[PDB]
Design a protein around this ligand. Sequence first.
Ligand code: HEM
Ligand SMILES: CCCCCCCC(=O)O
Length: 422
Amino acid sequence: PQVKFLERPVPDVNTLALEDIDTSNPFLYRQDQWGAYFKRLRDEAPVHFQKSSQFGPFWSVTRYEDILFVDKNHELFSSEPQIILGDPPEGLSVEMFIAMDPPKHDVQRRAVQGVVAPQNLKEMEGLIRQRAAEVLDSLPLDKAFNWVPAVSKELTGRMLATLLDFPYEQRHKLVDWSDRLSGASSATGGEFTDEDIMFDDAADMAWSFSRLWRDKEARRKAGEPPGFDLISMLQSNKDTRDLINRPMEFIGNLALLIVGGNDTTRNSMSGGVLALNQFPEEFIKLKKNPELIPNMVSEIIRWQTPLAHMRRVATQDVELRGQTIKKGDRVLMWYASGNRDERKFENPDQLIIDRKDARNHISFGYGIHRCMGNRLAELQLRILWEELLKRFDNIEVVGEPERVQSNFVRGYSKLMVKLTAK
Ligand code: HEM
Ligand SMILES: CCCCCCCC(=O)O
């Protein structure tokens, strides 16, 4: 049941009773209230029950420490049946291993893990660097342009096409299908309300992925050598040779990977540019010390936290910081709060590119569901920033960033950038 969320000014959090703070509001990030809202919960109600929202009753866990406890304890806090606050559109549910408990989760993850293993990422690195070079060489100088479509959306589309060996000139479909899956109003308070186009996406996605399998199956029978892409790898491994005979698992986990990498990588790419503009000393420091890029990528991902939360269901009664979460209660782990928790990160709101524990961020989560594409994400941002510093002396954000409506995605729709050449 899809709802067109209407933007009302969000109240100053100090003018509310604790019981009334609703973190499911998808305009908290846009209106720059998320910070104050999460600070007050961290300090006064770090394990907080909201009895009423558009999405029903849910708990918010906002302290770094408590997020680790919940994320680690998969047996107490199930990932089934969903991993977002709300529900997917009626009859348009997709079986992803992210929304799965062991042993089933482990089997499906093992089947697909190899594609983003550092060994296989080495095979792709040259192509990802080349496709990055092309886009950056195409950008206008001394002219403000929208970074989101031009670089972030573009590089992300290419990344997903590279990974799947998807028809390169149909790569916009992977972004479009991903946006409408993860941005459904019913799931995340996103802007997407049209369920007809979502049924179209399901048909278009099941067709195109079944086609890509058959095309690769033919080239292999024709004796062509297996490539570095996911379908090649799945067709090589004997467990996943007949994966097209498990259509739920096949389309589900293919959809999971594209949803997985889409907004996440894009908003990391946009977020990084903004973070270095709001903290101009960090950019001066990055240019003098470009060996900081790897750690900066960790700090950008901590600072952005592209996915605000992940949801779980208590499998039994669980005591947590003096609160009793009841069997069946929905629990949000607010990673966006944990990565700003001064109990872990001194000066948690500042971008510090040489932050020595940057890598201890929880943007990828923690435990058996820790991000499968972490290495791919870090690679793409490292590559982006290596290629940027080669070409550009300054990256100047102009005007105000426009932010996406969601309680799940922390993203940008517009980020106006002026480039200066070296
Ligand atoms: C900045 C980029 C990214 C961030 C911030 C991110 C964040 C996350 C988070 C928070 C989880 C779940 C953690 C948990 O429940 O404990 C996750 C899982 C996952 N991510 Fe990512 N991710 C990113 C990039 C990617 C990319 C590029 C891919 C694939 C190409 C990907 C694929 C996945 C998959 C498959 C899972 C499910 C893991 C499992 O359930 O076993 N992610 N990611
Ligand atoms: C880690 C990426 C997985 C996000 C799943 C969102 C799909 C839905 O809204 O049902």
